[PDB]
DNA sequence: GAATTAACTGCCCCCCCCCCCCCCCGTCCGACTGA
DNA sequence: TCAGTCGGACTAGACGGATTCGATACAGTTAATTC
DNA sequence: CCCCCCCTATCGAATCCGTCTACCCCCC
C-alpha cells in the first residue's frame, strides 16, 4: 500500500535527511506528504527551504488534487468489513466493522467491549471470503484484561489452529498517557514492516480520569486526546486498517428528572465525540444478553440489536 | 428619495481603504452629495494583514487614516461614524476593569475618537427571559457622563426603551 | 522480584537525585519508570531535562515494548492463585 | 579544604449570587391494532 | 389466530458544587570541578 | 565626505461526579 520513505532520496534527498525523518516518525511518504511545514521544521537538521523541498517531492508522488465523485464511490465500494461474530451485529451494522475510519464502544461495566475487542482480534485474522481482513491484528492494553483464553476459544470455535492465531497478535501495555503515545510510533514502524488490518486500544481514555484529576487540568488533557486522537485519524488514513477504541461512562448528577432514571453519558467530551466516526452505545440485557445501539454514524440509520456472550465469544443470542 | 442619495463602496486591503478615503471621499463631499461617512468595519482589514511584532507599521497606518478622517470631517462639517470590533481582556489600565470585551486595535486608534459607544447584548444566560437582551453604553465623551439604556430591534428599526437609561 | 532505585547509581544519576525519589515515594526502577514526566517534575529540585535523563536511564533497564500473545500467554500460565479455604469458591474462581 | 563555575526556581489575589427545565438508559403492562 | 406498538399507573422524591493555561532575564541557593 | 538627533499588544480554551429505605390488616 503505503509506499516506503526510502523513495525519496531517488528525487534528490541526501540520505541523513531521510534517516532524520524516520526518526521523527515518518515512515512513508505518505506521511510525510500528510504533515504540516511546521512539523517538518521543528527537527533540529532540517530548515525552511529543505522542508519546502520534500514538500514539494512528496506532493509529486502522492496525489493530492481534486477528483470526480465517481472515482471516490467507486474506490470506496471495495473496502474490507470485518464481521463481528454476531449475524444482528453484522446486519446492523450492514457488513461489520469499516476500514480507514475510527469506531468507539462505551458503555457501563460488564457490558462485553472487551469480549467485543477479543473477537474483532480473533476474527481479523480469517480470509476476505468468510467476512475476515487477511492481516494482523494489534491490541493496546491500559488495564490489564487482556486474556488469551478467550482468544483460543474464539478459534476453536472458528476452526483455526490456536497457536498460529496467538502468533499473529502484537500486545503491548501502557502505565500512563505519555508511555501510551509513545507507542504509536513502533505501531507505524511495524505497519510499513509487515501487513496489518486492526488496532484496538482498550480502554482509550482510562489513564486520562487519573493522570489529570481536577477542572485545572482539564485543557491540557483534552489537548492531550485530541493530538492522540490525530495521530491515531493519520495512521489509518496512511494504511488503511480499523481503528476501534472502547470508552467509559460518566452519572448526570443534576439529574433534570430524566425518565432514564440512571443517566450517563461517555467520556471525553466534545473533542471525541466530534473525532469519532461510529459511535456504539452497549448495555445489558437479561441474563448474558446485552443490547448494542448505533449512536453516531453518517450512513447508517439509529437501530438497535441484541447480542449475547458465550462460552465461545461474542456470538447471536442462543434461544 | 431614500435609495438615490446612499453611496455604497467596496474595499479588500488596507491599502485599497487608504486609497478610497485620500480619493474618492473628498469628492463626494465636496460637491455636496452626501454629508456622512460610515465605515462599516474598520478593524477588519486590520486584522487580516499585522501580527503582534508588527506594532510600528500597523500604528502608522492607523495614525494617517485618523488625520485623514478627522481633516475630512473638520472640512465639511460631516459626521464620521466608524464601526468597530471587539476582543476578550483573557485576564491574567485602560479603564476597563471588570469588563469581558474591549475595543480593538489597541490605545493609538482610541486616540483618534472624540465620543466612543458600546453595544452589548447579553446571551441566554441573562436572556433566558424570552427576548434578546441589548443595551447601548457610553463609554466617553468631553461632554457627556458614562450612561446607558436598552433598545430593541424590530421590523421598523432600533427603538430604545423608554424609562431605562441609567444615572 | 523488583530492583532497587540504588542501581540508578551506576547509570550516572547524583546520590541526592536518588535520595530525593526515594524520600518522594519511589523504591524501585518499575516505579520510576511508570511514572508519568509531570509527576517527576512535580518534586522539588528536579528539572525537565534531569526528568528526561532519569526516564531514559530507567527504560533502558524496564522492557516497555511490543511482544507478542504467545509469550504474554506462556507468562501467564504461572501466575499464583491462592485458596480461599472452600472447594465451592476455588472450584467457581 | 576551598576558590570557582554551573544548574533549578521564582516574580500573588478576584469571582459570595441561586428559575430554567431538552430530548431517554424509563420497567413494564393493558389494550389497540392490523394482519 | 398473534405479536408489534400507543399510551401510560405503577405506594412514596428530594439533594450542589468544583480552576488553570503565555510568550520571558537576573539574582538566590545548592551542587559539581580542579588546585 | 564631515556634524545630531528617534517606535509599539495580541489573541480564547475546556467538562466532571452519584446518595439515600419506609410501612400492617383482617373473622367464621
Ligand atoms: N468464559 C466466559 N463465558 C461467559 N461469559 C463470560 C466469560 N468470560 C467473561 N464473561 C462475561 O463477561 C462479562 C464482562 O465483560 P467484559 O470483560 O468485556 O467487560 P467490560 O465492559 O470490558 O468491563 P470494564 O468496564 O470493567 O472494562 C461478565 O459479566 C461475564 O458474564
Ligand atoms: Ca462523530
Ligand atoms: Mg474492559
Redesign the pocket.
Known sequence: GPQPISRLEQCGINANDVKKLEEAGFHTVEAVAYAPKKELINIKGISEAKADKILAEAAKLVPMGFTTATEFHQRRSEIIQITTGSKELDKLLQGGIETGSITEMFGEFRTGKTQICHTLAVTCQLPIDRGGGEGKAMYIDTEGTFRPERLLAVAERYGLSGSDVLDNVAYARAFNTDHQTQLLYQASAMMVESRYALLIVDSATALY?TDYS???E??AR??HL?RFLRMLLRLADEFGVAVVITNQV????????????????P?????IAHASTTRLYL?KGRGETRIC?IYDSPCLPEAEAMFAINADGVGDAKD | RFGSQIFIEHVADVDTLLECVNKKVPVLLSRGMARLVVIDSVAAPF?CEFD?QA??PR?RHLQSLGATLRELSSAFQSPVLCINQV??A???PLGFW?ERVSP?????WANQLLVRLLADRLRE?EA??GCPARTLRVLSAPHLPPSSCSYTISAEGVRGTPGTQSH
Open positions: 480520569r481536577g477542572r485545572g482539564l485543557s483534552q489537548m485530541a460518566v452519572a448526570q448528577v443534576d439529574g433534570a428528572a430524566m425518565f432514564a432514571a440512571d443517566p450517563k453519558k467520556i471525553g467530551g466534545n473533542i448495555r445501539k | 486584522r503582534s506594532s510600528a500604528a476582543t476578550e483573557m485576564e491574567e471588570d480593538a486595535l489597541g490605545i493609538t444566560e433566558a427571559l
